[PDB]
Structure 1
Amino acid sequence: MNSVTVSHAPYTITYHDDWEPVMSQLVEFYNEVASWLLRDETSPIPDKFFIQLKQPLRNKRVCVCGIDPYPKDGTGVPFESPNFTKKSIKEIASSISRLTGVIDYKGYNLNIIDGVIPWNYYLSCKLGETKSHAIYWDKISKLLLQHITKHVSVLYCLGKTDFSNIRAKLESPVTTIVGYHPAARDRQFEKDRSFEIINVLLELDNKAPINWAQGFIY
């Protein structure tokens, strides 16, 4: 782990050595955007804006991309709810249970599966409003996503609309699966076969399939 000082909060950004070639441009962009970002309250807090940089990627293969942190209960861990109360992760647990048969469980963390890195495109959002803070974030978001897809085998995106043109912003072609967001109407995310397709494409890449059950906590 390495840490780097920015011109504003947190003034210290810890990251794993995989993220090393990103730090300079990340620092520049944040020093540019920080105060106007600070103009609103964020979920998670500004202090949490860089807990997704310490996670190593060399053992991460399937990147589950979330467009933004939640408007409330922002904790910096993508899709995460400390009490497992978020509807999105509830649907995620439902689909993974249906694939895996796990009838009884208490929670599901996407961050405790080897090969899977839950990820945020836009690092923050304003309280109760989605993607309003994307404007200050564009450069940082694109930077992080490109550095990530340098390594991750599979890119999965929750929400077809919010990920309409993620292909253009990312230069190197990569295994990309664009799926429903869990907030999709008529339970179309239940109909989503995303994870099985993900495992199949991993095997097509001669890669280890994801044991999504490891994310379950009983």
Structure 2
Amino acid sequence: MNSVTVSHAPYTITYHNDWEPVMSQLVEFYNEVASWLLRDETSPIPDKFFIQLKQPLRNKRVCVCGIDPYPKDGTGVPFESPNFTKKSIKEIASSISRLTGVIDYKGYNLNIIDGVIPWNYYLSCKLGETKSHAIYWDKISKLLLQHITKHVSVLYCLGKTDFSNIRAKLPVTTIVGYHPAARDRQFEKDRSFEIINVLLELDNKAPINWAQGFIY
């Protein structure tokens, strides 16, 4: 583990060694726009903006990515819902339940599954307004995502319309599935997770054990 200083809150950013190559523009990019982000109450709170940088990248082969945090109650861990109330994490868990057969569980977290890094493209939003901080995170978001995609084999984005713009880099397998909170798309939502393992050892990589996310 490592650490850097920034001009505004959260003042300090702790990060895993794998993130070193991009940390120097991150600091420069953040100081430029940080003043704007902190004008607003955010999801998550500033102290939790960068906590996913503590994650290693070399052991990751799948990135499950949403466009930005929950409009409220963000934790800094993408999709995480401590009391298991957010529709997204509830719907994701349902899909995994139908794929694995696990029926009894109390919660689910993408951040405890070997080889998976859960990621939010924009790292904050004005409380209650999705994609409201897109203009600020822009250069940071491209910088970080591109760093992720050189390590992972499969990038799985959630939100067809959410990811309507946004550039990504080759070669990475990239699927844009339906947002977990989207209406009757249970069939396609389920098989999107299922197809990820098929794709992973097309690239001859170990499958993902999605059942590891369950909280009992």
When the two structures are superposed, what TM-score results if normalisation uses the length of structure 2?
0.96
- C-alpha offsets along residues 153-207 of structure 1, whole Å, 9 cap, x if unaligned? 100000111112334577xx31101100012122356654111110001111110
Distance 1:128 1:144, change over 3 A: same
Residue 149 of structure 2 contacts residue 172 of structure 2 at CA under 8 Å; is this kept in 1?
Answer: yes
Gap change, CA 1:142 and 1:101, over 3 Å in 2: same
Alpha-carbon deviation of 1:12?
1.1
CA-to-partner distance for each residue in 1:71-127, whole Å, 9 max, x for gaps? 111110000111011000000000000000111111111000110000010000011
| Residue aligned with 1:191, SS | helix
* Counterpart contact for 2:177–2:189, Cα < 8 Å: no
Count of residue pairs brought into register by the alignment: 216
Please say if residues 18 and 56 of structure 1, whose CA atoms lie closer than 8 Å, have aligned partners that are also in contact.
Answer: yes
Asked whether the equivalents of residues 158 and 179 of structure 2 are also in contact (C-alpha less than 8 Å), the reply is: yes
Identity of aligned residues (%): 100
Aligned counterparts of 2:79 and 2:197: Cα–Cα separation in 1: 20
8 Å CA contact 2:43–2:124 kept in 1: the answer is yes
| CA RMSD in angstroms, aligned pairs only | 1.4
Q: In structure 2, do the counterparts of structure 1 residues 189 and 66 end up closer, same or farther at CA, with 3 Å as the change threshold? A: farther
Contact map agreement 2:160 2:179 (CA 8 A) in 1: yes
Q: Secondary structure at the match of 1:73?
A: coil
CA contact (8 A) 2:66 2:157 kept: yes
- For the 8 Å contact 1:180–1:189, the answer to whether it is kept is no
SS of 1:190's partner is helix
Aligned-partner Cα distance in 2 for 1:2–1:90: 34
CA contact (8 A) 1:180 1:192 kept: no
Contact 2:68 2:125 (C-alpha < 8 Å) held by counterparts: yes
**Cα separation, partners in 2 of 1:174 and 1:191, compared to 1, 3 Å:** closer
Q: Distance in 2 between matches of 1:189 and 1:7?
A: 47
Inter-partner Cα distance in structure 1 for 2:80 and 2:187? 18
What per-residue deviation string (whole Å, max 9, x for no partner) do you get for residues 13-43 of structure 1?
A: 0111110001110000100001111110001
Partners of 2:178 and 2:188 within 8 A in 1: no
The answer for the alignment partner of 1:100 in structure 2 is 100
Instruction: Name stretches of at least 5 consecutive residues in structure 1 with no aligned partner.
Output: none
Question: 1:118-157 CA deviation, whole Å, 9 max, x = no partner?
Answer: 0010000011111111111101111110111111110000
Query: Does the aligned pair in 2 maintain the 1:43–1:124 contact within 8 Å?
Result: yes
Provide the rounded CA distance (Å) in 2 between the counterparts of 1:47 and 1:191.
32
Inter-partner Cα distance in structure 1 for 2:209 and 2:20: 28
